[PDB]
Amino acid sequence: LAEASQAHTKALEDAKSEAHRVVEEARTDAERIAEQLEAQADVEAERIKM
Amino acid sequence: VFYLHSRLLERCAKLSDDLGGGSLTGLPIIETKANDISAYIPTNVISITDGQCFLETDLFNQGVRPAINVGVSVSRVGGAAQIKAMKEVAGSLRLDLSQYRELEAFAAFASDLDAASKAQLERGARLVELLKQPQSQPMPVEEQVVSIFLGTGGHLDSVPVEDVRRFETELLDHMRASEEEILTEIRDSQKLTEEAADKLTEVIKNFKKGFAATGGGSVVP
Amino acid sequence: GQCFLETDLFNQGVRPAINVGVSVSRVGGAAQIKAMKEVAGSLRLDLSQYRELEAFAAFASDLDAASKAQLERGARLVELLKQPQSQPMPVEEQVVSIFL
Amino acid sequence: TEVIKNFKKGFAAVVPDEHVEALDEDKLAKEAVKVKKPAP
Amino acid sequence: ATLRELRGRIRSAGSIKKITKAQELIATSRIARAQARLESARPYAFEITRMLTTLAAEAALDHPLLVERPEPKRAGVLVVSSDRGLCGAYNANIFRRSEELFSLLREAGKQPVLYVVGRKAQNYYSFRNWNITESWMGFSEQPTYENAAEIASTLVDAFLLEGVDELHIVYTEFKSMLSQSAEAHRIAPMVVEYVEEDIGPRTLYSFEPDATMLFESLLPRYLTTRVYAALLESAASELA
Amino acid sequence: ILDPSVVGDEHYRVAQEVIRILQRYKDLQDIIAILGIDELSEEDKQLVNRARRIERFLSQNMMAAEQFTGQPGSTVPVKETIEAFDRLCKGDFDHVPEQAFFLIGGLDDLAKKAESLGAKL
Amino acid sequence: ILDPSVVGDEHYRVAQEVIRILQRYKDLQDIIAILGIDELSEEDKQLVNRARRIERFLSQNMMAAEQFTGQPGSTVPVKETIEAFDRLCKGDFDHVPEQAFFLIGGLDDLAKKAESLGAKL
Amino acid sequence: TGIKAIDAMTPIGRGQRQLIIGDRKTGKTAVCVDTILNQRQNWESGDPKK
Amino acid sequence: RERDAMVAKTLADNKKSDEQFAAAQADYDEAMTEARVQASSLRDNARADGRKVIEDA
Amino acid sequence: AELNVEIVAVDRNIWSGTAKFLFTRTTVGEIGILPRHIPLVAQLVDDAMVRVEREGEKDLRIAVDGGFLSVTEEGVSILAESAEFESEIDEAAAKQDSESDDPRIAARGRARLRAVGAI
């Protein structure tokens, strides 16, 4: 019982940390996509200008 | 009239290196009526050309777009007009699609099917969802290689068949943003080496653990 | 318009052999009295839908209550429109029949 | 409507043989408790 | 317009051919499974049969289910049919055998009483204006022993009583996978046949509490395991 | 102009789903006519009920056909049509009979005629 | 000209026997594919193995493949072909693995390809 | 052609004649216009061999 | 009585220990699917408002 | 030597092996079968349990429902409308079902309870 009680919170904090890591990677490639998309926006704008 | 069309289509040639090496690739278009490919002008131009892509209305209505009938569509040039990567990832595709088309009568009796039969049925459904494509959105050859690697490599068996399309898109999007080196290797080397296959597989695994299906569940094996 | 008569419907006992599905009159209610225009309002569409429904449910094992009710009403309406040769009916008696 | 309904009350609106002969009684199988004690 | 019509007919016939071939292969798989069930249910039937004959060796054979009732007035026939209808002359053969049995019963002053298992028997008998005492549906393809227990309980309760003098079952016997034969069986009252001696100086059996009570408590279990075996043979025959 | 760039994403999605359902129904019609509907799957029976309700809901009592059915005409905005056929394809009216879909207008007419036949939605 | 009046009686008999076995195998192929080889009978399993062996021995090392493999092309006399397929249909090669029948000549090539695979007779 | 179905199942070479055959409103013009649009990156390379 | 209490405490300990053991992976998958849904709502809000940026430009 | 136990349900061979001792409960009281024993036939009680005791393992415990017992020269043979091992009985539903009013299901519950060690 003692070892299961400690392993519960161990797995809990491990999941917390790894999930924070994954959502951080998501919030990274999110702004990556935002960059790419605004770039495409301005190139389409200049295309229509020409 | 057969002369009228063959005289025109026999000028689409692939010249020698002694003549410059130029080439002219012909894409004629024929409108059949009620899918009567046995009419006169369809017969002529089918006899003249090197291969045929048969587009059908029934397939178009079923959501299969482009509505190409991969069963009767042929190319007499064949793998000689493919890069090694596409030549090897798409060889495991025709037989799978044929097995799916011959098993899709048992789509409602997967309980009574052998394990291999049900596996072929599900892989074929995923592959049919893989060959769909929006209009006015063509893909470069390395992205098609990665998509067909997803399909034939088993990396779509964990994804619900109603999500495959999205998954594919998103994965390519990820690889267009994070790992461009894989696509660059496939584009410059025309082949998918073992190192690139390992890199692509681990990228797929990470993306899968990051992917969110529409049914709610995870797509991890 | 057209009153398309068929040999199949003739042999089945439907006489006149009018194919109610494909027969039509492009004047319609303008060529009827008020009583017949009201009682025979959507008779042709009801009978077309009944023929479609019976063709669909020819081999069903259990239908709903509305489908069964429609099949019974359609069978009665079919039996009601049969008529022997050279036996005309006045317009009031036809009104009474289609009201039945 | 009421004339119709009052006429409706005055309106006057078995197993087939199948001619199948009898089964042979020798064909009617009999479930039997096969006693192994002789007392016929 | 006949050419479009003919192409459409070809397409529809191709669809039908595909569906029926799929159904044939599914039926092959399911007949394998049904034979499995039958040969897995055989041993308990064998053992209860030998225990019943051991009991009857030293029993008072006066049980109502074992005595021929004088002046038979009614007979309860249980006709085992299918629910799905893509079989061949399966139900037709069942009904022919049941009609022959009904004629044999009318030739002995007995009014047949009709219990049915399945929807096709219900159709055939309601179209012929029979009054069906009790029907059972939904388990003609995968019958469980609970269905057999219920059916046999209803039949023996109708026997021991509105009341019948004997019970028959018309069902399909499965054999050799190429011949399935409709059969009429008389399941009650059981015929007592004294076969042999077999054992003379044999170690006598002890019975607890006694032979007669055990026998009269085991007979209905024997009848219901017979009905179970009948349902299993009928399911295998229907799949074939 | 049946293009996601012209009519919007939901209009186009609903139209493509209606077309897919009706095509599957047209493919099953011959089987249903020969072998019976009970031979299909449960998915296919569900789709067949939906397809019959959908093909009846595409019909409408037009203004110029009052001379042929005695019934006045109806008008349905495009957004009401989109949402109604979305609900049909999702299965929100699979309990309403096949009638009450036949020669009506929008969803209010559907409710009226469904309750005229003893049902709700 | 596959006729006893032209090819003879033994040729015709062996050809009809091979064709019968192959047709039965093609009949069983759908049951094997959908439901599995395990469900088959034992006479059916024997016939399937014999038919696979025959169907593979129908192949040959062609003279047109010599440019790619270097192995000279085979020219099997018709008598040797009749004898080889008679012995196949009898069963004299029901134990030899399948890969020993691909692209070989007559019977001596078969025996040598088998012995080079740890299987004789 | 940039289309997965064609590029994978019915490949087209440089000198081949491929017939796009179909009834109507099945996507033949769409296939050919996509084949044309896919050559934009080949054009941006400046290589007369590509 | 306290020996009975000891064996009852043993059974309850093992029981709710297995319970908490399973709940560990339960909350683990719960946290991860929460993270997945959060991550997919992210970057898709980004796709949407980026499409809006292109349509307004 | 040992005896041979063969417990066959109505539709499936439940268990079959060799055993050193076989405890059960007839409608005339408890009983224990040993390698040799007079031939006997006896109806097990409504909620019978059957404790088989093997030489090199633990005592298997089987809740039997609808059973009969037949001991012969070869070995024991138990019939059963339904048999459920000790390793598979859910104490929750088994206990909750015991106090039902339906006789058959209550007997099943009491058997499931005896097999797992309680009651």
Ligand SMILES: Nc1ncnc2c1ncn2[C@@H]1O[C@H](COP(=O)(O)OP(=O)(O)OP(=O)(O)O)[C@@H](O)[C@H]1O
């Ligand atoms: N891959 C696709 N995905 C979705 N829709 C498509 C696709 N390809 C074509 N379409 C749709 O099909 C419609 C008609 O297709 P298209 O005009 O290309 O066919 P076509 O062969 O030119 O027929 P026709 O020459 O008779 O007009 C277009 O409105 C287009 O939106």
Ligand SMILES: [Mg+2]
């Ligand atoms: Mg066009």
